Structures are given as C-alpha cells and as structure tokens.
C-alpha cells in the first residue's frame, strides 16, 4: 500500500552497462598483386597497406562498437605463388610509423622483422608494433588510429609473371564501448602527386597523376572527400572565366591501357546519400595552377 | 641444406582459424512514441517491434561477423514519462512468434510475461523466448532469424499527451564465424494493406495505405525491394495504355497532416549503388487493380 | 532402429580452368551441398525424406604441372542462404585453405549437424548444411583440372520415394536482368552472375520463381506484354563461355520446351525484369 | 613534486528548454570537456600546459514542476572526435542515464585518465577526455531549466601562462553550407547543424579552418570571387532561434569585425562552400 504521487519515478535500470571488452582475432589477406614480366623493376613498390581494423574485414565490423583497440599480436605472411625458375627478388617489412612515406629497400631492412627473398620462396615477417591503445574512429593524427603499414618492394626484375599474396595474421583487443558510424571508421589517404589544371579533362582526371598506391587500386563508384578545396575554372558562356569550388571526388575503374583509372569531381549530398557531378571544366588560356598539392588527404565518405 | 624444388610449398599457416564465439550484451531503446490526447483509443497498436540484432544497434554490428546468434537473456522495460493524472492504460507483451500479426489485448495477456498498467506507471516484461540458435543473415523463413516481437497497445483513452519509451535489455551469444554483408542483415517487413491502382499519384503513393507500423515510421531516402512485382500503367503518348514492371520503392518523410508519408517507386541499380525514379503513372479508364496484395514482403536493400 | 547410417567419399565436382583464363576472385566451383551432388549418397537420399550430416571434409585435388604457379582459396560457407563468393568471406570461415594450384589441401568445415530434408523446399536452410566455394587467387599459368572430393558420413531417417527433379539445389541469380539487355530471342547467361547456371549443361531447363515479362509486337507498331516462367540453357563456347538462355514454355508432362515470343523494344522506360535473388530450380530430368 | 592536484564541483552548463519546444532527439546540451568549461578549473588550467583527469562525474539537476512528464537521456562520450549525438550512440556509452525531467541523475563515465594539454591543438584527442551530451526523450510539457554539474578532480603538471582565447574548445560543423543557402549578407546558423554554435552568444567571433568563398559583383553583370575566414554570430530570437552568421574580417590586433562583401548569385553551378567537419574556433575574447 503506497500512495499515489504526482509523478512516479524512473525504473530504467540496466542502462549504460554494456559489454565492455572483446579479444578477437583471425587472419586476413591484406593485398594481392600480379606483376607481368617487364614490370617489377628494382624498387617497384608492389604493396603499401596502412593497417587499420577496416583493412582486416572481420575486425573492422567489431570496431564499430568500441572506441579503442590495442594490438596484441601481428605477423604477416608473404606467400607468392610462382615456380622455382623466376629469378626475381622481393623485400618486405612493417613500418611502425603509419605516416612514413619513403619506401626504399634500405628503409625496410632497417625495420625489425624485415625479410628478403627470391620470388619463389614464402616468408614470415614478425614485426615490431605499438601494443598501446589506438582509436577505432579516424582522427586528425594518424599516429593514433594505426600501428604502422606493411610495404613490399621488388628487388630484381622478374623474368615471369609474379602472383604475390600478402596475408596478415592478427589478434587484437577492443577496449571501449560506443557506437561508431561506418563513415568515420575509414582510413585517410595522402596523395604523393601534384594535380595541375593543365593536366585535366572537361569532367574527370587520371588517378595515376595523384601517385598514390591506394587511390590507384581503389574501387568503382567510390565517393571521396578532401581536406583542401579543389579549384575548377568554369564559364558563364560569354568567353567568361569564372571560378568554382568543389570538395568531393568519384572513382571510376581503370584499364589494361590505363592501370589506375579516372576521378570525376562533384558534390556528395550527405543528407540524402547521393552524388551530383561537377560542372564542365573551362579549357582556357589560364595560367598554370596546382589545384591540389602533394599531400592532400582524401577520406572516404560514402556508405560502407 | 635443402635442394631447389620445381616449386616450394605453401606456408599459409594460421588460416581459417578465426575467433569463434562472443557473448555480448547491453540495453537498447527499441522504440519511442508520443501520443496526443485524442489518439490512443482502446487497442491502438502504439508499438510493434520485431526483434533482430539489427534493431539492437551495438549487437547488430557484431552480428555481421558471425552466422548464428542465440538469445541468452531478454527483458523489456516500458517507462512512459507522464504525470499521475493521465488516466489511460496500456498493455505490453512479447509475442514469441515473429510472424504473428494479430495484436489484441487478449492475445498479449495470453503471452507469458505480459503486463497491464496505467500510463503513469513503469513496467518490466520478462518474456518467454526461444533460447535456440537463430541466424544473423535474413532468410526466407522468419521463424529462424527472430525470436518474436514486442507489441504495446493502448487500453483506454489518454486524457493527455503520452510519452512512452520502450527499452530492451538483452544478452546474446554469437555462434558462427563468417562475414555477412549489411544488405542481407536487415529484417523483412510484411504489409497489412492492399495497394489499389485507383489509390495512386503520377509518381508516388501514401505509406499509411500499406497499413504497416514499420513502413509508416520508416526513415527518409530509404530504398526498399519487394518479392512481388509492381504493375505500373504507363503510356507511349498516343492515348496508348502500356504496361511497366518495377520491383523497388523509395521512402519520403511524412507530415503532421500526413503521419506516415510517401513512397516513390523506381529502380535500385545495385552494381553502382544509385536509385533511378519510376515512369509517369498513366491515369486512365482502366479496371480497378490490386498492384500489391496484403502480405507483400518488403526487404531493405540500400547501404546500412 | 529405423535410422540408417551411410558413409563414403565422392567427387562433389570437377572443373577445368584453362590456360590463362581466371584471375584473382574467379569462382571455379560453387557447390551447394545437398545429397544429390554427392554421388553415392545421391541414391540413398532418394529413399528417405530426412538426412543429417555426421561428418564432412573436402579434399581439394588439383591436377596440373608442378610449374603452374597460380593459386586458390577454398572453404565451406555454412549458410546455404549466403550468396557472397568473395575471398574475404571465404577467409572468414573455419576450415578455409590456401595453396598453389599443384597442391591438394583439405578443408575442414564446421556444419549444422542437425536434421535436414532431402527434397528441396522454400527455406533452404533445412535442405543444406552450407556450400563450398573455391576461387582463384592468382592468374593460372596452365590448364588446371581440379577435382574436389568430399568424404562424408550421414544419417538418413524416414523411408520415402523421392522425385529426382525435386532433389536438386535451387540456384540464385547474382545479377539483375535488365530489359535493355535482351536480344530478340535470348540473352547472355553471364548477366545473371551465377556460376552454377553458367556451367549448367546445354539443354538444362529452369523454372523461375519470378515472372519473366517479354514485351512483343504484332508488327503494327503495337506493343503487347507476354509472361514466361521457364528458361533453356544453350551451351557456351569459346566466344561466349557463359552461353545463352531462351525464354519459353516448359511442358511438364511431355518434358519439352517451346521457345517464346520475340522481344520488341520500342521506346520503353528503364525496367528491372529479374531482380537479384531470383530463384531458378532445375525442373528437367537429368 | 612539481605537480598540483585540484578538485571541485562546478556547473558545466545550463540550458533552459522552454515549454513545448523540444522533441525526442533534440540536443539540449553538448559540451566538449576541457578545463575552460569547468569554472574553477578554468583558472587553474591557464597556468599550466598539461592536465590529467583523476575523477569525473556529472550530476544532472533539472528544474521543473513535478508534473512535467517529459524525459531526457544523458551520457558521456569518450571521443572528443566523435560527432554523433543520437540516443543510440549515447545509450551505448558507460554511465548513460535516462529519467523524467523532474529527476536528477548522476552519470558515471569512463574517461581517458591520461595526460592532456590545456591549450587547443590540431588533434583534439590530446586536449579532451570526451564530451557530454544530454538529449530529449519526449516532448517536454513545461519549461525546464536544466543545470548540469560536474564534480571533477584533476592533476595539473607544468607551469605556464596561457592565452585564454586559445584554451577554448573547437566547434565542428554538422551540416554543409551550400551557396544557394546564403542570403545577401548572412545565413542562418541552423544550417551548420551545431548546438554549441547555435547557442554561442551574440557577437561571438569564429575563425574557420576552411575558406568561405563569396561570389560578388561590381554591379556590371560581372561575377568575381572573394574569400573570408571569420564569422560573427548575430543572436537568435523567437522567430529564428538559431540566429545568423555574417562573414567578414576579424582584425586580431584591434579585436574588431568588419562585415564582408554582399553575395551575388548569378546562374552559378551547385557548390559546397563549408563541408561537414569544418572547424570553428572561438578567437574573440570572452
Ligand atoms: Ca570513436
Ligand atoms: Ca549468414
Ligand atoms: Ca521429401
Ligand atoms: Ca599550452
């Protein structure tokens, strides 16, 4: 027998008490290449993979529920498929800084774990990694969301086709409970090539021009966004030179003739999840202009 | 000292040995309503939520890595916010069949756990559930992907605005290791209202017409797909009656005047992730036609 | 007891992937596991309605020269419903293996181990424990003639006589058929995106669970609409390895196909005819 | 030792959400936790560069009549970077609470507990342990004047003198500014989707990390382009509760704003001016 109050009180009991930790692990292919005989000149950077949960598929999904993750174990396997008579050499190693962009044989052998071997032999690279707790959501500083990157370079000239596959065996612990939308979980990518407005087409441009191993082998229909604005020289149609400012790109698949592919600029309307295309570039007697400089950061924004 | 073979052998060691089980749990709001005074007539089905990992947000993400899940514990809390002088009553209960569509007070009280209470009191519904292992990927039979659904009905007429919130406290074990794309993890939805071709507009139609509590409170820009084809009567433009066949819809948000909203038919191009709109419906002296019958299953296909 | 245990080793399937064809990802066998596919068990199943899997292993068995230098990934996906052939999906499964084309390997899956039906039905999670997919991981240098063997043991439960056209696995489309992809009388099998359909022999007949609408004309500038439920496979060759499908009428009594009406395209609006996830049972006898 | 421990209880913020305004989801306080926001700690932080959090709890404290019958959800999100105010996001955090508007509650978060900086910097995961968001869960019947209190203890490490305009939390845009949303001289604050900006007082000045391009004309039918880096908040009222922003020039020496050029729209192609994730620091003194 209790009295009738003005208002009863809340009985929302179990709240805010979600599962906290998960250890989780597996083995994931982190890249695959195929090199035709002539290609594979000394030093050709066959692979460069920045490690982030997202790259390890199974992990990538779990990481959308917690805010931190910390690496407990990593190894990579190299496992090219090729017969004994191939006379080329590779060198792999895990660079513990995810920002480091200089890929030389010399800079890998320097890394702990680094391996060197003729194409017909497999190899295991037991690297050195942070084992501290990084973040699952991408951020401004990369040093905090990734433990480093795995690169593999050619060492001689392959006599024949090389079918390399590079597997990463991982185990990791997810620390903090939270809900992270799949847009923010993507890894940022730095260009290593200047985009001139003399090197253009009316509505697109080459992906090899940007000089980035990820953006080169990036998939189709894939909407990106940039930190730096893109300057498009358009016209009213009186011979008039006007100026347009777009922030977003769209990847189109490449060719056997054009290894890397295209990139159509435009507008990524996020409220409605759609992608408009960008205005007709006005070819003109306009002074030469770098529209996007070396080091432009491109972060994937569309639904994954 | 080993000899040089024709081909060395594979050294892909740790493969196919991923993490297998995860227990995981939390508490999630499963719906929220607000009922203005007049609304809330006896029996008004205020809530009807089919339970699936996806509905429990944190869980929904983990479920994309395993193939089965099995429920270890469930309770729901009811927790309306309203002051003591509101004189209306509700009745909640968890229907252990996810297909059961008859929502009567009588059919809830029948369920184990079911509760009855005036709006100003909170309640906990400790239900009966399968505790067997269901599947995370949606399938043809629903009985196998969901343990049932939680419905809440009005019991009198609310004198005042009712702000109910319904929280589900869950704990579940994910059984089987695998990678499931977010398109297949969505829950299917059955319409409970016939769509006549007399009740139409040139390019859209009402969402209340379908008579489905989910499709009514479904979000904006949300592309669906159907099991049954949709028959659109179009024209060549000579007074000609031609026939068109579309499989896909698009949700547009609703009004204070139109509670539920619109639905624009069309084409969901999945290769490229885009949505074209459907042709101008030809209004004509055409015999009355049910385009989509009661019980049409609508499964969400766009990126989540 | 009334239950019958049966065990054996049997070839699930055999592909030849010729020289140079095939590239990372190329699905070289995609086999939905049901007793019909397992030869000796095939006949045992025709007798009872229900089977349950006791043991399952696949032994991969590829045949090529030692210098072949390609590669494959194999594994067993437990969801006969899951329709995702990517490497990533496979590498996620238990059992999964990777090797060079000259190396046999044994995949050791995990499977339902519960009581399933012999004859096909709506929900195919009760007809099958899963499916095995084997993919290319590189480009194969040589002709490889891969023969995937399955060692199996099972328990068969209630005696029955089973119609053999019913025992077969339903095949699902992976790609949409658009109206603007139809030729006058046929279309390319590859459009449907399905390896089992692409490799189904010449003259296979399939029933669809969704209507195939064919716009046609009398030749008066007048567009009319027809409906069809059956396809006939016309074999693929070097020029068109996927082959072709003609729509038409399957007569179930006489077991004969009659080709349907010609497609007439006349300024029609864009249309989806056969959405992805269209189900295609083999109805013709084998 | 050189390190200084300091503890107190302080009001993080105070909102009034008036009668009938506010609906499930409506963010009523979104406060990025940095020492400036915590009053007494505010001054302590101006002296050292580095602080570390020892204890943190927020006590919610809403004030209304007992018959108010709305509701709120509160919680503390550990990622100053994470920009997601939904209930689902909050309910996922540790500490999270729910109550009727007349009930105080105490959120008990989990936080970084590591060594952070006092002055703002590029990566704001080193300036803050996270942010607290409190949302509506129903429609509030009455005026509620919620005052959220924080009991805190901290360790301050290296002595320093700190510029107070630098100590402030950067605010991030949640919505894009489109060119076709500009008025001649201003635009509506609500377009940027940010509660802290929407409630920033009249006359607040903000610097952007991205250029605001303004197309203008001389009045000859000739379109020209200007660039601006500063905004001034013009206070919101009942008709436009979010208020408005004028672009222009902030003079950092004289601490004065000069309004910029008028926007001229003349058959321009669709453009994104300020994409979502544009960063907006408070530069004007307080
Ligand atoms: Ca985060
Ligand atoms: Ca599945
Ligand atoms: Ca049977
Ligand atoms: Ca400082």
Residue numbers in the entry:
A (entry chain CN), B (entry chain CN): 34 to 337
C (entry chain BN), D (entry chain BN): 52 to 337
Paper passage:
Here we report protein crystal structures of a piscine betanodavirus, the Grouper nervous necrosis virus (GNNV), in four different forms. The overall topological structure of the GNNV CP consists of the N-terminal arm (N-arm) (residues 34−51), the shell domain (S-domain) (residues 52−213), the linker region (residues 214−220) and the protrusion domain (P-domain) (residues 221−338). The P-domain folds into an independent structure, including eight anti-parallel β-strands and a short α-helix connected with loops of various lengths.
We determine the crystal structure of the T = 3 GNNV-LP using the ab initio method with non-crystallographic symmetry (NCS) averaging and refine the structure to 3.6 Å. The ordered N-arm exists along the icosahedral two-fold (I2) interface of the inner surface, and extends its N-terminus to the icosahedral three-fold (I3) axis to form a β-annulus. Residues 36−41 from subunits C1, C10 and C12 are engaged through hydrogen bonding to form a β-annulus structure around the I3 axis. Sixty trimeric S-domains participate in inter-subunit contacts, forming a continuous thin shell of the capsid with an empty inner cavity. Three neighboring P-domains per iASU embrace one another at the quasi three-fold (Q3) axes to form 60 protrusions on the particle surface. There are three S-domains per iASU, and they all share the same calcium-binding structures to facilitate subunit-subunit interactions, similar to those seen in the CP of some RNA plant viruses, such as tombusvirus (DxDxxD) and SeMV (DxxD). The flat conformation of the subunit-C/C dimer is stabilized by two ordered N-arms alone, in contrast to alphanodavirus, where incorporation of the encapsidated RNA participates in the T = 3 quaternary organization. Although the structure of the P-domain can be readily assigned, the protrusions of the GNNV-LP show too poor electron density after NCS-averaging to allow a complete characterization of the morphology of the P-domain, which might be caused by the high flexibility. In addition, a structural comparison reveals that the truncated P-domain contains the rigid P-domain with the disordered linker region, and this linker region of T = 3 GNNV-LP also exhibits large B-factor values. This analysis may provide insights into why the flexible linker region allows the entire solid P-domain to be malleable, resulting in the broken electron density of the P-domain with large B-factor values for the T = 3 GNNV-LP.
